[PDB]
């Protein structure tokens, strides 16, 4: 009685400071565990003193069609990553670069994805296993979608080094697309993605973003589904650093 | 001894925002510091349902707030077009749109720097813009801790920090005595440029309004923000 009403508390506060279109629920059907007080909500990355994070964009396309026309991506020297149903067709590693506030093209433009917000309804859930909180859909989730980004507190290579001595799993997210500078820490700061657990079966997968931001010491880091992952399915990222063995039920074992 | 601790106190109030704009505080007139207990927080603070638009285009459809029987506050350069007394339904958590959505302005913050500075003619703290602000412009909302209207007229026993929720309802007062944002700091004048809308975003009961401060006129960068509180 008094569980339940500390959780929906917590679900209203979640949902007061979350900007995108999707829900976020939370259930317990499993213990008397009520809302983490270890957890801050944040839509976009939050600064460390000393980390400048300027969306320094001034030039954008000036398509009329996105999608056929030699646009935001071209000019970077890389491939349109979407398809004209918002599905991700470049392979791993490969940049995001997507239309920004300097863009002539709308709000409809196929290549404004990541930066639309997360579209899918979640569910913020106690396991039934000993593995804590974790998230699962609520709604069907059409293979390689954006579900969410991976956001936290911004800090340097050092301070990520130090702060990953307090026991490889860990809020820790290393932006080493192209520089080893710069890191994410999600344990204090962070949205949905924090409470998503580990799998050797992962079914999300991590591309750089690239908006207004253009330093490519700091990309933006999306998820998107490796799978249709239908209503009710935990979502799960390999976040398990690394002889490793992993600790996921049906494991695969090793790494 | 002046000079260190009002930094402190900014880079205080700095970490405990959750909006955009900065927060600066000056001091070129007295001696004072800080205050001592005052605490800074971004939404009603209390003490011991739902329902979202379908709409694909918020600004012209059948909204939230034609859903209250009322109209979309807002225009196309984000200024309010509705006269005094008329309540916000913003869009919210439960609505179809995005961020995009015209009609999610006040939920967005505080948009402009402002700074906390002494006054110079006895008045104490006031509030100034660092940049200039458009008129029917929100600039931020009035926060504190939530009381009954029983617990406001006790607190009330010693110009107040009391402001009634009272858009339908006597029951719910709002004290920001203790706990607020910036807004704590605003001056009184009897030719104010803010005035009060009541919002509503996902909650919807008429008990419990938000405030938000909107400029009655222009405000130019450096001029003082006041409203008509008395
Ligand atoms: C780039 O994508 C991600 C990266 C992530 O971490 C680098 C995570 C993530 C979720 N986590 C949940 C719990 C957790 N912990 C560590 C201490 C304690 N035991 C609980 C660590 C953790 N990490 C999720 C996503 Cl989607
Ligand atoms: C609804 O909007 C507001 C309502 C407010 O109070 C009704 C105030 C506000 C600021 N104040 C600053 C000082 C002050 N005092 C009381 C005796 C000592 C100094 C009282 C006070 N009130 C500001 C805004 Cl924006
Ligand atoms: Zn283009
Ligand atoms: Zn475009
Ligand atoms: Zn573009
Ligand atoms: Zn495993
Ligand atoms: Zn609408
Ligand atoms: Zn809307
Ligand atoms: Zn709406």
């Given at each position: 009685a008094k569980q339940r009403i500390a959780l929906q508390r917590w679900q209203d506060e979640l949902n007061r400071r979350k900007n995108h279109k999707g829900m976020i629920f939370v259930e317990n059907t499993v213990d008397l565990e009520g809302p983490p007080s270890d957890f801050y909500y944040i839509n976009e990355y939050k600064p460390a003193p000393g980390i400048s994070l300027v969306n320094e964009a001034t030039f954008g396309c000036s398509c009329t069609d996105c999608f056929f026309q030699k646009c935001c991506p071209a000019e970077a020297g890389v491939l349109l990553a979407y398809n004209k149903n918002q599905q991700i067709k470049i392979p791993p590693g490969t940049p995001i670069y997507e239309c920004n506030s300097?863009?002539?093209?709308?709000?409809?433009?196929?290549?404004?994805?990541?930066?639309?917000?997360?579209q899918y309804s979640l569910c913020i859930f106690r396991t039934?296993?000993?593995?804590?909180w974790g998230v699962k859909t609520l709604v069907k989730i059409k293979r390689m979608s954006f579900v969410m980004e991976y956001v936290g507190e911004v800090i340097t290579s050092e301070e990520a080094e130090r702060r990953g001595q307090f026991y490889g799993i860990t809020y820790l997210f290393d932006?080493?697309?192209?520089?080893?500078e710069f890191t994410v820490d999600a344990a204090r700061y962070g949205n949905v993605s924090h409470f998503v657990n580990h799998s050797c079966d992962p079914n999300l997968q991590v591309f750089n973003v690239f908006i207004d931001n253009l330093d490519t010491r700091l990309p933006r880091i999306a998820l998107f589904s490796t799978r249709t992952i239908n209503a009710g399915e935990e979502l799960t990222f390999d976040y398990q650093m690394k002889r490793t063995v992993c600790k996921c039920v049906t494991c695969r074992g090793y790494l």
């Open positions: 300097r863009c002539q093209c709308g709000p409809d433009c196929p290549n404004r994805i990541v930066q639309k917000g997360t039934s296993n000993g593995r804590g932006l080493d697309y192209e520089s080893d």
